[PDB]
Amino acid sequence: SEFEAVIKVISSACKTYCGKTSPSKKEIGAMLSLLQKEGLLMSPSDLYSPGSWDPITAALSQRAMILGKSGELKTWGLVLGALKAAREEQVTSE
């Protein structure tokens, strides 16, 4: 389904643009599903839009501060790094 396809795209991007630090597919899935739970994303593909990136950081930051749950924030740090790197690579090539 779309959820699994997005996890696989993100995993691949992370391998290319992070490397050794890459989060596992289930960690990416936990982060993505939590963001859906909190209403930040409708479709899992909404994560790809640069317009969602600051809202996601804010929400996961808030979760760490209020619940002491920072796992998803750490995963996002890696995912966002890879997404920014990918976008920047596309920008400079285009």
Give the total number of structural domains in the chain. Answer: 1
* Residue recorded with tokens 């790809």: 48
The helix or strand, by DSSP H or E, that contains position 71, with its residue range, turns out to be helix 71-93
Q: Is 19 left (phi over 0), alpha (psi -120 to 50) or beta?
A: left
As a 3-state breakdown, the chain gives helix, strand, coil percent values, each rounded to 5, of 80, 0, 20
Here the tokens at position 70 are 């920072």
Provide the residue range defining the domain that includes 92. Answer: 1-94
Structure solved via: X-ray
CA angle 67/48/28 to nearest 5° reads 45
Rg of the chain on CA atoms, in Å: 13
